[PDB]
Amino acid sequence: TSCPAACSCSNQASRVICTRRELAEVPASIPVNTRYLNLQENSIQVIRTDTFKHLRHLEILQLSKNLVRKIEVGAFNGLPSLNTLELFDNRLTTVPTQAFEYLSKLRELWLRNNPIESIPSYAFNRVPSLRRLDLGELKRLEYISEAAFEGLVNLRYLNLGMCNLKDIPNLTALVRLEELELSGNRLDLIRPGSFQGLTSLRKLWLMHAQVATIERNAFDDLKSLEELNLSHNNLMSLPHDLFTPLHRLERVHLNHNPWHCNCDVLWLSWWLKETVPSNTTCCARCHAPAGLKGRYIGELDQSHFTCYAG
Numbered sequence: 282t283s284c285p286a287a288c289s290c291s292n293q294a295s296r297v298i299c300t301r302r303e304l305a306e307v308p309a310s311i312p313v314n315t316r317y318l319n320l321q322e323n324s325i326q327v328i329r330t331d332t333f334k335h336l337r338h339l340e341i342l343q344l345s346k347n348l349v350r351k352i353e354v355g356a357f358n359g360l361p362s363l364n365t366l367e368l369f370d371n372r373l374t375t376v377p378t379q380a381f382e383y384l385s386k387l388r389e390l391w392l393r394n395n396p397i398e399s400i401p402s403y404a405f406n407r408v409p410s411l412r413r414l415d416l417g418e419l420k421r422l423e424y425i426s427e428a429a430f431e432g433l434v435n436l437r438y439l440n441l442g443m444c445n446l447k448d449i450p451n452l453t454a455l456v457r458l459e460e461l462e463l464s465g466n467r468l469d470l471i472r473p474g475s476f477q478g479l480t481s482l483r484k485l486w487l488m489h490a491q492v493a494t495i496e497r498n499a500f501d502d503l504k505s506l507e508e509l510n511l512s513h514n515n516l517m518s519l520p521h522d523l524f525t526p527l528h529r530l531e532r533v534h535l536n537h538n539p540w541h542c543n544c545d546v547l548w549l550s551w552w553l554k555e556t557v558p559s560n561t562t563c564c565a566r567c568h569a570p571a572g573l574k575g576r577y578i579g580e581l582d583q584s585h586f587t588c589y590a591g
């Protein structure tokens with residue numbers, strides 16, 4: 282139950298903290314009783330095979346805010362009690378597939394803000410047990426395999442926010458997914474099959490996604506959807522019946538969009554009235570035309586614009 286020189290060991294050596302230190306490598310003599318390890322804010326560059334083999338009881342392992350660029354094969358061997366593994370704010374150029382060793386208890390994996398360039402096929406089929414995955418802020422990402430998320434039949438939260446994404450990737454593997462964060466992407470056009478097989482999804486976020494066009498039927502698959510955020514995008518209108526199938530959708534953010542208020546958006550105003558009736562004049566405003574400018578989309582009706590069948 283010894284404490285390493287550079288760490289502060291609480292309890293009977295269950296909670297070990299080693300932060301704000303100038304650690305170049307992972308310290309030794311970590312007591313076997315450790316269930317929590319915080320090595321955040323250090324200068325660690327490499328993690329080696331069996332570095333943690335002796336820690337049977339480790340549940341939470343925080344290796345974030347470091348310089349980690351190399352994670353050798355079987356680096357996390359010997360950690361069958363491990364739940365959460367944090368690796369954000371590091372210098373990983375690729376996802377550390379090899380490091381994984383069917384860690385059935387692993388539930389959270391945090392990799393945001395790393396210079397990862399691509400997520401290859403079957404990247405996480407050593408860790409099917411994952412519930413939360415954080416792949417946000419991967420600003421040098423250029424490719425996601427179609428089979429990248431295969432095996433993650435238990436994933437519930439995914440974060441692909443702030444990754445330069447011209448297109449939504451294949452997420453048909455993520456059968457049980459509930460929250461998807463796609464904000465801060467270059468998602469220009471949203472085609473009909475963009476969220477195929479995400480029938481379990483409840484919250485979807487597309488804030489600051491440079492979304493100009495949403496084609497008809499683009500959300501048909503999201504049958505469980507409750508919340509949507511299309512705020513701070515470039516939407517001028519939404520296609521007919523975009524929400525008719527989404528029976529449970531109760532919260533929609535539409536603000537900060539150059540909404541053009543003509544009869545193409547008549548349906549939406551009525552959807553707003555039926556779905557969120559307490560909102561009389563707030564807070565999704567028309568930019569065009571003048572005379573309708575500043576007005577809440579959902580306060581408009583048939584007298585405000587001329588309507589045809591084509």
Ligand SMILES: *[C@@H]1O[C@H](CO)[C@@H](O)[C@H](O)[C@H]1NC(C)=O
Nearest residue numbers: 533534535557560563564565
């Ligand atoms: C409805 O009003 C609420 C309460 O202020 C606000 O948060 C929301 O932006 C409004 N919803 C829409 C769809 O404009």
